Amino acid sequence: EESFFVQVHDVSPEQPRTVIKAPRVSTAQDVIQQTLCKAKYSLSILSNPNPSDYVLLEEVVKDKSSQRVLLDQECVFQAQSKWKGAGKFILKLKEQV
Amino acid sequence: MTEYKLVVVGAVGVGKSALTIQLIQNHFVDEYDPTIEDSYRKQVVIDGETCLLDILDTAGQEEYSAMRDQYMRTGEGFLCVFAINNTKSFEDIHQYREQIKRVKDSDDVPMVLVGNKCDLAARTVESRQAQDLARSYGIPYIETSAKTRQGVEDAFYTLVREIRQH
Numbered sequence: 001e002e003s004f005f006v007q008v009h010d011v012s013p014e015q016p017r018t019v020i021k022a023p024r025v026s027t028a029q030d031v032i033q034q035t036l037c038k039a040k041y042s043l044s045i046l047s048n049p050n051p052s053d054y055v056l057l058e059e060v061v062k063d064k065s066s067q068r069v070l071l072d073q074e075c076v077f078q079a080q081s082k083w084k085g086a087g088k089f090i091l092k093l094k095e096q097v
Numbered sequence: 098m099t100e101y102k103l104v105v106v107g108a109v110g111v112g113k114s115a116l117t118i119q120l121i122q123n124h125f126v127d128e129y130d131p132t133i134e135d136s137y138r139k140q141v142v143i144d145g146e147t148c149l150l151d152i153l154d155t156a157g158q159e160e161y162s163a164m165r166d167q168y169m170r171t172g173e174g175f176l177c178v179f180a181i182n183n184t185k186s187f188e189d190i191h192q193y194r195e196q197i198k199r200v201k202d203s204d205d206v207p208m209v210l211v212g213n214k215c216d217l218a219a220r221t222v223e224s225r226q227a228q229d230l231a232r233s234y235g236i237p238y239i240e241t242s243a244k245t246r247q248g249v250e251d252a253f254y255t256l257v258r259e260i261r262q263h
């Protein structure tokens with residue numbers, strides 16, 4: 001009950017997806033850092049390894065999909081628990097958003 | 098551009114992630130970090146044609162066995178890995194082959210048997226034991242080292258070929 005599983009999408013060109021086991025207390029920044037560790041040998045990641053340069057986007061199907069950028073310090077487990085809604089988290093550079 | 102959906106399976110610590118990472122990224126990871134489920138992608142040329150490889154790297158930890166059914170439905174071909182210094186992993190291979198066979202309802206699923214860590218001295222599983230198993234399944238057997246790259250391209254391209262020639 002202390003952890004949950006998150007799949008993160010669009011991580012790098014050579015590693016599209018990863019599943020990680022994160023503490024339920026984890027912020028978006030905490031999950032981003034775990035993901036960057038998993039993809040740490042991807043060339044795009046060696047190039048830009050700082051988690052503060054990234055966001056997680058959530059995309060959720062309605063009841064068409066909506067998207068929303070998570071705040072850096074927002075609880076990922078809280079966001080996932082609110083989905084209405086089949087959903088996914090997408091890693092993006094802040095500069096792309 | 099044909100896309101090939103490859104799946105790497107086998108017991109904990111046999112070298113599934115190291116083999117995949119050697120193929121995709123051309124370096125050897127010496128640290129051990131147990132996988133849950135990772136997806137990788139690479140464009141390669143095999144017999145003069147550009148191919149897209151979608152490679153699913155799966156969990157050896159028995160904790161995650163309930164994920165198997167889904168990835169076995171979607172996968173087109175399976176790399177069944179054991180390590181030549183790990184007799185239990187060689188025993189465990191048979192359970193992966195049978196589940197894939199059950200899930201896909203076929204005795205003809207593209208697969209390659211891989212004996213990994215062939216760079217290590219004092220092996221405990223004999224090549225001939227694995228040859229006999231592969232023969233009974235009707236599939237290729239190849240030995241590999243993720244550390245030295247021995248057999249790595251051969252193992253994955255042989256599997257692509259098994260799908261292509263099916």
Ligand SMILES: Nc1nc2c(ncn2[C@@H]2O[C@H](COP(=O)(O)OP(=O)(O)OP(=O)(O)O)[C@@H](O)[C@H]2O)c(=O)[nH]1
Binds near residue numbers: 126
């Ligand atoms: N000497 C040698 N070490 C290897 C070889 N392949 C993998 N290793 C090492 O074996 C350990 C486990 O390798 P992994 O690839 O992480 O094993 P895995 O099968 O993905 O393990 P799980 O994801 O937990 O199922 C690591 O420390 C690797 O460096 C090899 O061919 N030779």
Ligand SMILES: [Mg+2]
Binds near residue numbers: 132157
């Ligand atoms: Mg692994």
